[PDB]
Design a protein around this nucleic acid. Structure first.
Lengths: 283, 273, 283, 273
DNA sequence: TCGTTCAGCTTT
DNA sequence: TTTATACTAAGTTGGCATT
DNA sequence: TAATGCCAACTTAGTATAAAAAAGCTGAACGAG
DNA sequence: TCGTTCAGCTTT
DNA sequence: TTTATACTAAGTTGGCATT
DNA sequence: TAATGCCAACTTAGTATAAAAAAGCTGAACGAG
């Protein structure tokens, strides 16, 4: 049939995949792009060349990431059109997914200390959010949803929203390199913040993970540090955590703590992407 | 030749397949849905487009589960047709399978107790069945056919109808959370129920599994409980059983009692090691 | 091109896959069958119907196993013809692999005892081969290649020929159910057999695993036992071993001993295929 | 347009790709093999049959490794052509990749020692390089560029040219099996070799990695040793290093020293548990 | 009888 | 070797029927 | 009556397989005793 | 300022 | 989530060349 | 001379990705102070 008409149908299909809200939002945005990019002509007649032209359009503006996702979504949409008997061949499969390297810079312990310090004039919860993150290795989304009720007998219970992974973290952790004590930290969060969520606003209410990430970014700018390519973000406290615990305790610990069943993912958080010189220990 | 003339030939093939009556019946029904869902056109002319159109018709009515099974069958009949070369291509293959999350809700020990209470208006066998179903964790079809002679020197022998699994359950088991003694439950059965089968109708004869199920369902409604997704069914007493024994004794045990030939059917403590 | 000509070419390809000798022998036999079964016509023109006809031919003689393998080999041969630009579509893929259930009957401990006893008038090594097999769970091929030099400090070292799996078996094993002691058994093999291979001939030479299997079969017939479908074979001492150790020690032990990384395989050796009633233990 | 007119366009694309000179050179060579292996016909007319024919030509000469890489490149150039729609289909895709087992043989500590002995007729730097290569486990290209200034407070800093990995090796390591002291080996280097790079030519200047390799190869022959499959090469001193450290210290350590961002590059004791 | 290889099948 | 899928054989329940 | 079955159209749930590779099984014919 | 949602991008 | 494959960037060495 | 490089055509070896799903990042515009 026709592309835009099929994309209308395609959305409905997604509405039935049982994917999470954020996932659907992401997909919708890719389709919207596909609508502006490609004509409303018979699917059978949409050429690899035309598809190629658009993607290159995004690649040329430096939006390789966007290109790669858009290409994926279109592709899958064709696979569904094929699965419903409209097309018969995937004109996208012949394309090559745009190759792009991660621009975001990793964060070194020192940088963390400068920022942590720069976050002086920031809402009291920032520093706390920061410490809790590095000492636990949990994503910010999960971080901001932890409730005091998830702590039972010295262990903090976490069910990662993104992966479903379940872990019990001992409140006895410590980041010797940064002088951070999980327990001491949770105690400052209990008094100074007091809320049902371990991390809370000045009004004792839970925060949106986007806000926490937003303030980290400001404190970062407030630090005056410079980086190659893109700046480190809040999420980077996760690899930092992994790399720090790596050298302090062990690979496996880092791997279990971050909730990485796979090694492809673990060896990735373990990478500093050239930020520093790895001083090899005879351990 | 034609779709329907073929569905006709296809049936007779299945009949020779060597499967159980129920399976065959399951198949026949899928075929009929196809008969009422597609034209009696030449196999060669039946489009993926058309097939999907039918398969979506079911999905739209939320009958995803059925869409999947009908698709499955359709493809099988087409393959058989290609074997006999009535066609060259299987147009069902390009179609995707509707994925569907089970909606049936689980049963918690508190609810069981609550349901057991509403059972009072029910025949006495409903309760004994429920109790027996949680303590022995067997399928309803297998419960309904247990005979007193299957018990020997403290063991209830069961050859599961669905999978052929053969097990010997020790008549000493006991569900702690619900206070059920397989010995006491069996005893009540022999004195109250009277018949050659452990579970038995008022007419002192074996009960149909469709009935046990149906009467439990009555009690469930009668209890007024509410659930998310579809309501728990008699078959859920088997999962409550699995889960309970899982904790009381062991996960390994829950498996052997239910009799799964696999391990196919959580919280990681992080040690500072 | 032409089928028989392509099959000639196809063999060469296999000669380059780096597969083991036995594997190549198996493949050759499937091709030979494909040669008798199908004409020497253009690949493009060999119909699913013709392919179907042959396979059904084998299925009707009760050689479902043969059908399924033959179908596989042909299929792969088409995939290679397709990969070299002769054909373009796999006329076999549309076929359905013949469905067949294992005919070989499992072996119960009692049956093992009757046979073991029946193997009285058998060469002294049989009984030994039998005990060593059940107490170790190793395949007969590996069994007959074990050298006294593979035992170091109470552990028997095994590198499975078929899988590459490596395990060190403690000479301290015991099959309480059959009254079999690995150590006692290895000792009888040392004196009574004396050879470089732990299992040896009356002339102190290694045996072919086919022979050991052959004598077990005779002792079996000599036992007078009857079975549904096909009789148990020597290999069945492996599942027996697994099922026995299952109830005596644990699932995992059985799983590690037999060298099964996967659970699909482990839960399979664990199955008795209806031979007996599984008396459930409260463990 | 035509295969060769395209290979021409294709090259300029690769040139803009942002890869290292050596990579680009690797690519150019594959292209030339293609130029001499296929007609300068219209892309549309180039068959899978033909491509395979060429790819097998290499396989037959036992150059499987090359067959694979040429195929890989060919497909990339075709994809780029489809992007610009000079074609609709990639006829390389249907072709399969030649799988090839590495034939190069490993190096054992006894052989290293034996080779080290034949090295006596070789420049003094060959030995120091060998020693340095086993104790530091770095790639030959990275060894040849180590400067004395990369050492600070007991650490040799290395930024691996191939992968960008940055490491600080402690100048206290020691290979037991071969009696090598990184401290003593470095010391011999400064007194005997003289130059800004730790390893250095007679002319007191940096050596090419192709040379170190080539002279080790000479010694290997000169030693008269024999191996299965191809003979071990200088790069094998890195594996001997990995393996030795694996046992002496730890597998984890062997990994960090070689600097692998992964764990990608045996005997299970059975406990009666 | 003790033992081995070739073949066409079945299992893992 | 293992995850997704194809086969199998249930179990669930509204309506109408048998006892 | 109530207590129970049976049909039918749905939804669940237990197992075996896929792919390739590499065994294992055992009738025959053969070799040294 | 403390905080939140919408969007179009980048990462995991 | 993970195994196979596509990209990258070496390293190996015979011949011929530079110093 | 020897000691070393350089080209070229091969063989090896280190990493990032695939697929889909589900985040995370942060400019804007907006809301209560």
């Amino acid at each position: 049939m026709t592309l835009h008409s099929w994309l209308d149908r395609y959305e409905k299909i997604l509405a039935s995949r049982g994917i999470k809200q954020k996932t659907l939002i992401n997909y919708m945005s890719k389709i919207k792009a596909i609508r502006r990019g490609l004509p409303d002509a018979p699917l059978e007649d949409i050429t690899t060349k035309e598809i190629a032209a658009m993607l290159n359009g995004y690649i040329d503006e430096g939006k390789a990431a966007s290109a790669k996702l858009i290409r994926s979504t279109l592709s899958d949409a064709f696979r569904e059109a094929i699965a419903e008997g409209h097309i018969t061949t995937n004109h996208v499969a012949a394309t090559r997914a745009a190759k792009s390297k991660v621009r975001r810079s990793r964060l070194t312990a020192d940088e963390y200390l400068k920022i942590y310090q720069a976050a002086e004039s920031s809402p009291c919860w920032l520093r706390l959010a920061m410490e809790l993150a590095v000492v636990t290795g949990q994503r910010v989304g999960d971080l901001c949803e932890m409730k005091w009720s998830d702590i039972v007998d010295g262990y903090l219970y976490v069910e990662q929203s993104k992966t479903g992974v379940k872990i019990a973290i001992p409140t006895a952790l410590h980041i010797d390199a940064l002088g951070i004590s999980m327990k001491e930290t949770l105690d400052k969060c209990k008094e100074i913040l007091g809320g049902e969520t371990i991390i809370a606003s000045t009004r004792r209410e839970p925060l949106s993970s986007g806000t926490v990430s937003r303030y980290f970014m400001r404190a970062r700018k407030a630090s005056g540090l410079s980086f190659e390519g893109d700046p480190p973000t809040f999420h980077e406290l996760r690899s930092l955590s992994a790399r720090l615990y790596e050298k302090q305790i062990s690979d496996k610990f880092a791997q279990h703590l971050l909730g990485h069943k796979s090694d492809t993912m673990a060896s990735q958080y373990r990478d500093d992407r050239g930020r520093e010189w790895d001083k090899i220990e005879i351990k």
